[PDB]
Design a protein around this nucleic acid. Structure first.
Lengths: 158, 173, 75, 189, 187
RNA sequence: UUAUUAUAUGCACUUGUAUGAUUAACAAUGCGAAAGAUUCAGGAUACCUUCGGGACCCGUCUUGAAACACGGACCAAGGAG
RNA sequence: AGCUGGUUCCUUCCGAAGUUUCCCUCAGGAUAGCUGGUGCAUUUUAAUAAAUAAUCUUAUCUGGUAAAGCGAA
RNA sequence: AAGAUCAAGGUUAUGAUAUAAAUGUCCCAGUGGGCCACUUUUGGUAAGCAGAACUGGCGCUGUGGGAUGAACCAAACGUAA
RNA sequence: ACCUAUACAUUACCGCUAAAGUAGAUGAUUUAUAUUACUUGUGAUAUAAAUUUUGAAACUUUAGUGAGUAGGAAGGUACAA
RNA sequence: GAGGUGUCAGAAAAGUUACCAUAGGGAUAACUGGCUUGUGGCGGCCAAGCGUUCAUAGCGACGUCGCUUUUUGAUCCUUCG
RNA sequence: GCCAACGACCAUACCACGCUGAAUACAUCGGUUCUCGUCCGAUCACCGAAAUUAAGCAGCGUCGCGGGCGGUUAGUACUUAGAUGGGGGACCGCUUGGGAACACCGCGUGUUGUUGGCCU
């Protein structure tokens, strides 16, 4: 009957992968973590204090507490069955800022530029992101010679 | 199964930073414009990677049999898949049609080997000019002075009477 | 009389029926595990703020008379 | 619309004369019609079908051909046959088969006036045909226009192949049969 | 193969008050005529506000009528209460207004009429103000009830302040094991 | 410059078209023929007949009951949230 | 008696679960999940959105299976 | 660092949708004996065998189809042309 | 090409859900006219004709949908007092 | 805070019943049948060897593919009112 | 460029074998009163006088050893999704999407932050 402890299956979760071996280098702390910023939790198993319990590895939350040597990140974790909210106190040695958020911020500044540029052009804005549409009337010039070549196959050979 | 021959071309996606991915083409036997593209990727994959939808279709175009009244011998070179056993063929077909040749091919392949339309791969098409026809059955047709008996007949059933009182009458002289 | 231990069969059907249901982006901000102190002078912050157009204007008038703070940011 | 047909025809004419192959602008706008169940369907696809609004067999909606949509149509493939609908087909569908969503209730049309009815704020749209322009061209108010139509519910076409659940390549039905839908769709209305 | 006409299509909310009261429905019938015929949301919600069960209708007390007066832009105001209006002894000074209500308790009618205010029926407020001019619609405190306390009765998750369903309150009545850290666990 | 289309085409009358489930012009026939009562149309009443097709025994525990699972010959009346 | 058997009119509408946990528990309960009913508050998700819920896509994280490796530990 | 006061902002900043959704009470029944199939799999030579993962059915489902059939296929059933 | 499920399309019809109005009758509304006012043409008024006394705790009006054990709710029916 | 219930969310507990009794159970053994076929029985394939010579007259290693269900296990679907 | 101190990323910085290193300098490298630490003034503590860029360190070279990245390998492998597709089965074609790895090949062999100095 079952699995259950805490460290179940974490041979490769807490594995430092080849040539990244040792003492967690200082840049990790140098990043200032501020309440409301989106953070990704990545289990570093060499920093054994403030360990993010195995379900929380690559489950990403927003910061609602900063404490003297822990960052309290609210990960919303799918239960059987009512999404309860968990404040997990985990260290910065395991906590890395999500640049999922920066994409949003880059957009505000870009949208404001496009808005201004368009307004000074008079018309028109259309700053909302449209995914890759079936494109265009494509002219291929030979140049550099007509095509043609067909293909295949003699693919025997065991 | 409707045998129409199609020219399909496909480049592999379009970046402005990244010039002009090379343009491959094929002749494809398909009833279907979609089957023309479908086979086209599968054969393109065999040399040159190019998965649709990291793949760019390009143009789907049907090609024009040059001589459908034209009286020609075709050799087709063919690969088929048997159950434990993928092998190569050369067979020669006397047809109006490169389209008609392939349609008679899928039927013939289907029959003798149990030849799966999905299990068959085409290979190559050439029109045989002139005594390059290994083809014992084929070369019978090339023969000066080609007169040939009509062997047998085919008895429409019965009649315009279901009730044929005038007895067929296998005779015919 | 071997029964069967554990099927997660139909659990995921069950969940989507009346939705697993995400809560809220609370503009009215929840607390717990804030190191007691911030909370103490957060309480004072709210209280001392008493309201406010004259209060900001009087301390702006102090900052222009004092000017103030070349030292603090560099230390 | 008539000019639109001429532009395509002329691009092809001018190219081929200059030796050039002008390969003509890849198609926007798909019509999706439901061949399949709901029962004996996997839930990923069941969910995708509800969102499309395709509730019953042979009910069909128009769906904007985007990178977003096309992936939902892929998981939906054995469940759907789809193609590029001609303007005749869109016109046949709205005038005979086209109902309106007004506070739940599925409400006639046929009046110009009842289409002016809402869509005059989406300017230049005061007619039954002007709604189909907006659908056809994938005009900016396509979200609301497509919504306004409640899925057109369409008899059966004509001898619709026994093999049914095979990709169109295999003689199937199911697939993006492209331009060959125009024959199908016109008959199914 | 309808994907999916599942649920809910039974919805939620009373067309008509769940009451035998012949008086009550006449007010509903009156305001129902006033709804679409005269536009305006005062008719729309008072129609609904008659539908209301006795809970969701909890008694509005006279001191709540008197605090609303302290409000800016409110001195000329005929306070609407779709409800029972209850006398609050503690308000020394009860201000003048006409108050329109379904029912006014007899001790509450004397302190309105002493003020010197008028105690009014909604049908006479409908005549006066079919345009709902200078009303103020007050709704009672539902949070007060003993039933609301009991909901959420849960131990574990650092909550409740909920009141266990106890016939008798005292020592030997649920003080022990599970209320306190001493006898195993804190709530 | 030419073609096309719409507006400047009102009032009377109208078995005109539609008016959002627009079956009726027109006509023939039976017949209500006082009470009495002819004739016509229409019908898986009971039940009979003739034809096709479908119909395995309910109650129940059970994963599944027509079961070579169990109670129940048949009927009335008492008879259990 | 946690067992077996039976439980007495109809129609309409919606409509399960054999799973979780604990229990001398394992032929059973409680409990959570699924179920209905009762409603309530608001509908730009409401009566003549710049507010979401949850599925694609996109962007941004995670993973040691398939495959591959052993002239890599 | 929070609470937060004040001022600036073209188009609200992926796509379909919403059968309206969220929320509370009952602490409600019924369930706690599952069964089968695609796919993935462990034990076992294997089993109409014992046991998981995901998903659908059957359980609660006829009808049409597989001659036949709980489960497979097609399809979810108001009454009829 | 043909055959064919209670599927699918349309239509009538049942129910359930939805969505909207219905509640000046000492009054309202329609129709025809005579008179009067303004104007081409409309209204007022007089007269004559016609409709309207709504279980407004229901009807008129509308659309979408219906398998169903366990079970739940809703509304009737029968029986004795 | 400690002392403890290991059936470890916490009964305080020895045999025997072929003298037995009950309420049930095909959720469950024995037993028929069904699946399976390792094991058993029967039959092959390849062929190193035996056989004076000569692999197969009759045989046949090391291997390997089956069939049968009549061995025995494996199973518990049905049957314990 | 070099050098120092303080570092980031973390082998393009390592390894191996040579060559070279001017100047402000690290270093090489000396002395042992004192403090201080060592069995031993090797380290460590202190004093900074005589030498030297050979080494550390840095750079430069190397079809090296290793390491990075891209292609190639390979749309294969593998796999999601589909069929009243095939095969006796084991499994396998097709069809809609996604997509490796070893290997081989090419090209690089530390870059850069702060702060001070030196500049061939």
């Amino acid at each position: 009957t079952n699995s259950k402890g805490y460290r179940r299956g974490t041979r490769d979760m807490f594995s430092r992968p080849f040539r990244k071996h040792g003492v967690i280098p200082l840049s990790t702390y140098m990043r200032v973590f501020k309440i409301g910023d989106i953070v990704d939790i990545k289990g570093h198993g060499a920093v054994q204090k403030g360990l993010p319990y195995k379900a929380y590895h690559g489950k990403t939350g927003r910061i609602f507490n900063v404490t003297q040597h822990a960052v309290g990140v609210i990960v919303n974790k799918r239960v059987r069955g009512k999404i309860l909210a968990k404040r997990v106190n985990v260290r910065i040695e395991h906590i890395h800022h999500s640049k999922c958020r920066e994409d949003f911020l880059r957009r505000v500044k870009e949208n404001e530029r496009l808005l201004k540029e368009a307004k000074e052009k008079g018309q028109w804005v259309s700053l909302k992101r449209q995914p890759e549409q079936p494109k265009k009337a494509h002219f291929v010039k030979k140049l550099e010679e007509p095509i043609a070549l067909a293909p295949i196959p003699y693919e025997f050979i065991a | 199964g409707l045998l129409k021959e199609y020219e399909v071309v496909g480049r592999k996606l379009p970046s402005e930073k990244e010039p002009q991915t090379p343009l491959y083409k094929m002749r494809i036997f398909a009833p279907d414009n979609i089957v023309a593209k479908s086979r086209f990727w599968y054969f393109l994959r065999q040399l040159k990677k190019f998965k649709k939808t990291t793949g760019e279709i390009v143009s789907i175009k049907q090609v024009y049999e040059t001589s459908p009244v034209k009286i020609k011998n075709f050799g087709i070179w063919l690969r088929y898949d048997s159950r434990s056993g993928t092998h190569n063929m050369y067979r020669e077909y006397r047809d109006l049609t490169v389209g008609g040749a392939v349609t008679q091919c899928y039927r013939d392949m289907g029959a003798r080997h149990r030849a799966r339309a999905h299990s068959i791969q085409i290979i190559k098409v050439d029109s045989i000019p002139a005594a390059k026809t290994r083809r014992v059955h084929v070369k019978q047709f090339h023969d000066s002075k080609i007169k040939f008996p009509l062997v047998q007949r085919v008895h429409h059933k019965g009649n315009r009477k279901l009730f044929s009182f005038r007895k067929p009458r296998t005779y015919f002289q | 009389a071997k029964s069967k231990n554990h099927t997660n069969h139909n659990q995921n059907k069950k969940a989507h029926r009346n939705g697993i249901k995400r809560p809220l982006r609370k503009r009215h901000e929840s607390t717990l595990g804030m190191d007691v102190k911030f909370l103490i002078n957060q309480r004072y912050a709210r209280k001392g703020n008493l309201s406010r157009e004259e209060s900001v204007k009087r301390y702006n008038e102090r900052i222009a008379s004092q000017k103030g703070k070349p030292k603090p940011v560099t230390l | 619309y008539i000019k639109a047909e001429q532009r395509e025809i002329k691009l092809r004419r001018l190219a081929k004369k200059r030796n050039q192959f002008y390969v003509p602008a890849e198609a926007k706008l798909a019509f999706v019609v439901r061949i399949r169940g709901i029962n004996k369907v996997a839930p990923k696809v069941r969910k995708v079908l509800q969102l499309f609004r395709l509730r019953q067999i042979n009910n069909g909606v128009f769906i904007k051909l985007n990178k977003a949509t096309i992936n939902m149509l892929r998981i939906a493939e054995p469940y759907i046959t789809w193609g590029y609908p001609n303007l005749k087909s869109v016109r046949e569908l709205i005038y005979k088969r086209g109902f309106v969503k007004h506070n739940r209730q599925r409400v006639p049309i046929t009046d110009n006036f009842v289409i002016e009815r809402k869509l005059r704020q989406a300017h230049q749209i005061q007619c039954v045909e002007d709604l189909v322009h907006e659908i056809f061209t994938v005009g900016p108010n396509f979200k609301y226009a497509s919504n306004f139509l409640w899925p057109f519910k369409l008899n059966t076409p004509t001898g619709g192949w026994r093999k049914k659940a095979n990709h169109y390549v295999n003689g199937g039905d199911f697939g993006n049969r492209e331009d060959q839908i125009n024959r199908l769709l016109r008959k199914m209305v | 193969g309808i994907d999916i006409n599942h649920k809910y299509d039974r919805k939620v909310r009373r067309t008509e008050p769940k009451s035998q009261d012949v008086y009550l429905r006449l007010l509903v019938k009156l305001y129902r005529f006033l709804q679409r015929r005269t536009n305006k949301k005062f008719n729309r919600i008072i129609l609904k506000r008659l539908f209301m069960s006795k809970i969701n209708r909890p008694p509005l007390s006279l001191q709540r009528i008197a605090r609303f007066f302290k409000a800016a832009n409110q001195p000329e105001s005929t306070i609407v209460v779709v409800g029972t209006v209850t006398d609050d002894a503690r308000l020394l000074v009860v201000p003048k207004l006409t108050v329109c209500a379904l029912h006014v308790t007899q001790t509450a009618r004397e302190r309105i009429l002493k003020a010197g205010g008028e105690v009014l029926t909604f049908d006479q407020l409908a005549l006066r103000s079919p345009t709902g001019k200078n009303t103020l619609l007050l709704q009672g405190r539902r949070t007060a009830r003993t039933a609301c306390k009991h909901f959420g009765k849960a131990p574990g998750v650092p909550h409740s302040h909920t009141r266990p369903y106890v016939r008798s309150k005292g020592r030997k009545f649920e003080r022990a094991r599970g209320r306190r850290s001493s006898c195993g666990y804190k709530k």
